[PDB]
Ligand binder design. Structure first.
Ligand SMILES: [Ca+2]
Ligand SMILES: [Ca+2]
Ligand SMILES: [Ca+2]
Ligand SMILES: [Ca+2]
Ligand SMILES: [Ca+2]
Ligand SMILES: [Ca+2]
Ligand SMILES: [Ca+2]
Ligand SMILES: [Ca+2]
Ligand SMILES: [Cl-]
Ligand SMILES: [Cl-]
Ligand SMILES: [Cl-]
Ligand SMILES: [Cl-]
Ligand SMILES: [Cl-]
Ligand SMILES: [Cl-]
Lengths: 322, 322, 322, 322, 321, 322
């Protein structure tokens, strides 16, 4: 227990920092990318999978750039199925179709979005990043890539891809548009949180041990990666503090949370030193839609693990009967 | 690369140490346990799973003691399905049914054996250990529990459970007895290795980064857990070296390997410092059945990860067409 | 200094948690063990020791189970001598008679109680544990062994052994029953603290850097072993929090301290990260008999070392003239 | 001393691996970049420096891309001065002009080349990278950026910049073109080694504890950064080993060493676990020009530090009289 | 961020602890060492340096003991130059003349004082320590050497050397006595702070991430070296706490700060776990001369690095107008 | 197992390096210190000890310098008792009389020599060092204090004290001069080894996990303290290697072993990374007296612990009947 006590976490609502053009920045970003056709493509693949049909996905994300993914459809009688759009943790990528059997086995179509330029840490990826011309001086990793200007910042592109991933999922014929869920843990959680504010198609949010929240506090509290990439950039570029946090404010899950309206299930580990509880609760507490949080007092970044998976299935079942 | 060079690993066949009553010890152990009825129980669960039927399993292992498990049956047309009996890594247990969706998704019935007394490190378990009266002085963990005599040693009970697990799998009506696979990684690999020598019902072996192999070398090469448990016991009980290694000779994967006849797919990570390559290759090189090994030169204990899973599915498909 | 400041530690009295049947549970436990005869046996040994007479000890602890120990009697004229009953730290055991020369050299008979099932970490032991039938899923070690029910919990048996050890010591003819001291550091301290509440024969308590105190707080403050064994168990068995802490409440030093009446000398190290200062002071502050504490502000788990030994001799000398 | 003994290091000449088109790739790379004008720009700075004039440098490196640097010209009577082209270690950048006072103080003009896209670890930088369209999946850092094809690989661009840096230095009117030295430690040493083979203008090489050498061995020997970035990429992309090492063969200091003709002073620390001695000696031993090496047996990656600085000044003084 | 929040650091003025004979102890220490003649010697070196003239220095510090140093003089037309007296961090020594090119390059003469008995960790040294007869039981290092009595304590001799270093620098003919700066980081900073109180010749102080401050707090907040040397000594010698802290009170930068009058530029890293911010601010906040501090919130012990070097050049230029 | 295999350790006899004046250096050193009177003073202490009489010792060691110690005389009828002269490990000191109760309890007088200038790491000391005028530049600790000249080196003074300790012990009336044993572990072991060569009064050697042996190899094999102090000194003073090892040659246990004639019991831990096995075996294999070694294959620097204590008592008992 290195963070605020739980009684204080439950009330923690730090003063939010955002620029006055926060919304306009996102409106312009999405409008510019909507000018390119989504051109979603689903290509059935040869697989040893027997209970699921697997498709190679391609769609246009940020600025028409082609993003890969998987679509896993469980072999069931129902003509329309509910659907989970799944975002991936830091240094991960879409891997193989059989890496994502959980939701299909629970009777949900699952759209897994590959993460541009990552896919080399713990699971392979196939989607490149495409920068806005020059790739500035940065610290190793993604956290500081383009960080001196929100228009060039890496997560501008990722978030836009993620919003478009929902539209691509929605274009698949047996996807029930009334039951599209956006889901992620860690980086995936932070991507999902941004999507829960920017997407018009998402109906529910699953958001575990979210990353990309309350940056200024994160960097103060922990010296773990990936948040430490920002700290290390700041150690060297000592004249850039104000600029760095200005940029980051446009991508902070706390600011997106204040705008999200769809129902949400959060989870948090009180001993999580990768995504500290105070950063997660800051997001949760500002989250503007109907919400619940599962608190795992003795867990680190693993969170509630399989226990939380059970909670997520129960939560959605109940949500989509009401 | 801390271990022997790959060219030497491929030829590494250290002199084996075993007592003259190795086989008789195992014959008696099995014969005594076979006097208790197996009494396999399969109970269908209420589950949110939609593509798989899940059953709560109970069967009689070592000395009639009741061992838990899961049976996952994928919802397919075929009357008889092939079957994977899955053993679990150190500190793990059967967890939830949805923790084992891989093989069922590939059209295999999957029998997951819970590990007696463990289930508290990374995945919950539900089966206790039942010792042979007194529980001798030991180092924390399972590696030294009862280690001063093979009759009292922990893995005598686990291995017997494991052989009985194959019988329990085989009792299920939808299981094709010609395609029963025994499978495990790490501790699971070592269990499966023992079962490949002791079971009459097993048709194929999947054995990843196996643990419980070449104890004397393991303990001299690495200071990682769980092999360090043995080392720390020896640090204190300095008068017990000979007895400890005598006991471990009855449970060493290399000695079982020299007796196994069924086809096997092994995997090994050359930078694995939990199960060092020399111990894995010792087991592989002595393995007496038709065999292949996948070598992952840059991997630590994670081995081939999902790459190896692809290899396993390809390997069994080809095997069961011949 | 990671824990509360000294001024706050001196007043720290957190709300105690215990079940209504605390006392009854212990009354029954001891009554049930008293139905077996103590049958204490003292067997003089061949030894190179010249200033001390060494005896192999055996006595009946929990439920008649046979516990080992040593009795060390200094060669002195006096026909009745004072006596220290010594309990042992985690992963320790009775070792050799020459591992316990301090108190005999100070003119005290010393009864060293071996610890059931341990003796494999830093000093050898010879006493097994005997469990209550099934040995449940647990994390490696003794902290979580039987932890889902106070009737099955490991320390129920250790504490009962320890109460019976004082009776065994008292049965030795040369022991002055008016000057029997119970003593321990770390785990030994926690055991001695339990004995100070449950024994009728103990006349003074020496309690250094005690372990088994204020579990809830211990587990939140430090990630060191052995308290981390509980945290790790909780990380996995996420549905078992309330049951775990309910069990531990019956064995908590704080709850025993509130019942102990005999005079006591405690010690604490303010930088001790194995047994945190707040857990030790919680115990000391609730301790209901006449008491003193020696505070070592710069020491970690070693506490006052040999300096504290000097204080203990001086404390008992003065106590037993008064 | 974790590497080969010194007697063996002195003889270590592993078999070299390079593609048949090695020279051809470099010839085309340079020829394509030479079609863009160098357009060197030196702009005198307002500075508090009093013994040295400082210039802001800009020149065209790889494919006309604008690279920053500093030029430090010590205030001396001589019309033409000798000149050191300085390359910078991993995660470093050109920093401030006063970060490079050594060579000017010794009477050499110093040209410090900023490193594209780095400058965020231990010294700031101002020069971006400009990738060849898509920036593929990569591990955090620069070592795997574009690694699936030598045409897209990061170091192709760095090396081309570095060759052009020497031409930009040569264009400064006060530079004696007969006494242009190329210099670097670690990454800088590796860049310098490449330039010693590719540049026609360099007259001498200073190469300390070089990085970018004998990749295959580096990655097998040490788990330190930055070589571990390659290992980690390999751990995930298990199907990409052959391609990765193919690509890296075009950038390996050992293969450049075999082609360099200018005189060289190397240094090596025998306890260096960032740049292992065997990788350094492999480069040194294949180095085809007149050469010397200073061996620091007890030093890790810091090498000879200031002692080596003295050696370099003596080395060049003697070289440029002789 | 392990220490007090920045808002509390800016107000942190812990009650100071010093003995009533603090000043007399220092007055006597200096008076006794002033009885030996400074006898400064500057010996021109053969060097490959071309823009600087380098001299081997020797002068008499504590009790006439001969301390080594370097004097680096930039080759400039001006007949009088300003001067920086540079003190060295823990386990360092005077090294080579080319290890100190910064200030000379900025037009300042630079006097680098070698540190008695150290010079074996990250940069070579050539000056021995000469102890007061017996070298008491101590923990490895310099922090507890002679710690049981201020008169025998290692830093008494280092501080005395340091004060005399300024007199040595001042004796060089080109040195402008009106523009003598004392400078250090870490251990150097702590030495410089001491000299700022004890020297009559120093005109300005540069003090980065200073060490030797607020010992009682230092030892309770971090377990890093070198403060952990004291903690470890105390772990063993458990009967010696009061004596140890009494001795350290005579060498604590916070007590010297309360006495310094010369203008000062401080720097601090808020993530510094070698010299914790609360110890640095304690010294800055009690500092009695005109003062500024540069705060680097995201830096550990490296502080402002080259950024701070820029600040220091700007600060002095403005000060000496 | 990081060091040479056991079969090679048993034959390891590396070429010895020593100066031609080795013997003369020691002859002179001892002759000069013998010109001061030993002036041994035993002063009976008030103690709580009841089975042992404790004396405060003071004697003249190196150059008449006054060294403290303890003398512990067990209360026995015998008029003459055998005697153990005990030397202390690095950063230790004489501590309290009750810190050394083992040998008196076994019926031996025990003379504990305090270590000049240490006494501040793990046990308090009371004896200063008194250097030969100037205390040269050094790395923190004792290993490099005065290292640039054998005449100023710290261990010259310690070894001379240690030889004088035996004379001091001999002067006590109840000491049987025919049964004086010199004993130490680690630093104590290296001191004892020196004394076994230099003392004329010593009758047997107990030498555990000895330190101060085969320095050149120690420093190349391990990075642990205290050997690492030398390595660090060398990292900075890069021009001093030859001098440093010249000096250390006069203090190397291997060179003393080659001269010792008294019977000796050694011990060694094969996983000891503070005093590596190859250094210990080098000393043991060159040891010129009758000898035995107890090998503890699985132990670290703790060696045989209490088991070795048993061995030492049995060894001496047998030796002093023969
Ligand atoms: Ca707006
Ligand atoms: Ca496709
Ligand atoms: Ca047989
Ligand atoms: Ca009650
Ligand atoms: Ca017996
Ligand atoms: Ca060619
Ligand atoms: Ca006064
Ligand atoms: Ca001779
Ligand atoms: Cl993540
Ligand atoms: Cl495992
Ligand atoms: Cl304990
Ligand atoms: Cl580098
Ligand atoms: Cl420092
Ligand atoms: Cl030692």
């Amino acid at each position: 227990f290195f963070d605020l006590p739980l009684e204080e976490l439950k009330k923690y609502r730090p003063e939010r920092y955002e620029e006055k053009d926060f919304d306009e920045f996102w409106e312009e970003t999405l409008a510019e990318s909507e000018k390119f056709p989504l051109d979603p493509v689903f290509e059935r693949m040869e697989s040893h999978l027997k209970t699921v049909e697997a498709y190679d996905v391609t769609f246009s994300g940020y600025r028409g750039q082609r993003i890969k993914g998987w679509l896993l459809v469980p072999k069931l009688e129902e003509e329309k199925l509910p659907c989970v759009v799944q975002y991936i943790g830091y240094n991960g990528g879409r891997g193989f179709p059989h890496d994502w059997l959980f939701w299909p086995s629970m009777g949900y179509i699952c759209f897994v979005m590959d993460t541009r330029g990552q896919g080399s840490g713990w699971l392979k990826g196939d989607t490149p990043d495409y920068p806005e011309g020059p790739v500035d001086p940065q610290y190793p990793g993604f956290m500081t890539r383009g960080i001196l200007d929100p228009r060039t910042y890496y997560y501008r592109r990722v978030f836009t891809d993620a919003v478009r991933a929902v539209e691509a999922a929605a274009s698949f014929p047996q996807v029930d548009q009334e039951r599209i869920v956006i889901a992620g843990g860690s980086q995936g959680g932070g991507i999902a949180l941004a999507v829960s504010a920017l997407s018009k198609k998402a109906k529910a949010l699953l958001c575990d041990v979210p990353f990309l929240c309350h940056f200024r506090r994160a960097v103060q509290l922990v010296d773990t990666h990936p948040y430490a990439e920002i700290t290390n950039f700041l150690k060297t570029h000592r004249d850039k503090e104000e600029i760095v946090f200005r940029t980051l404010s446009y991508f902070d899950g706390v600011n997106f949370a204040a705008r999200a309206k769809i129902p949400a299930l959060f989870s948090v580990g009180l001993m999580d030193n990768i995504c500290p509880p105070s950063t997660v609760f800051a997001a949760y507490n500002y989250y503007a839609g109907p919400k619940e949080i599962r608190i795992y007092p003795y867990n680190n970044h693993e969170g509630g693990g399989s226990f939380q998976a059970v909670e997520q299935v129960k939560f959605l079942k109940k949500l989509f009967e009401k």
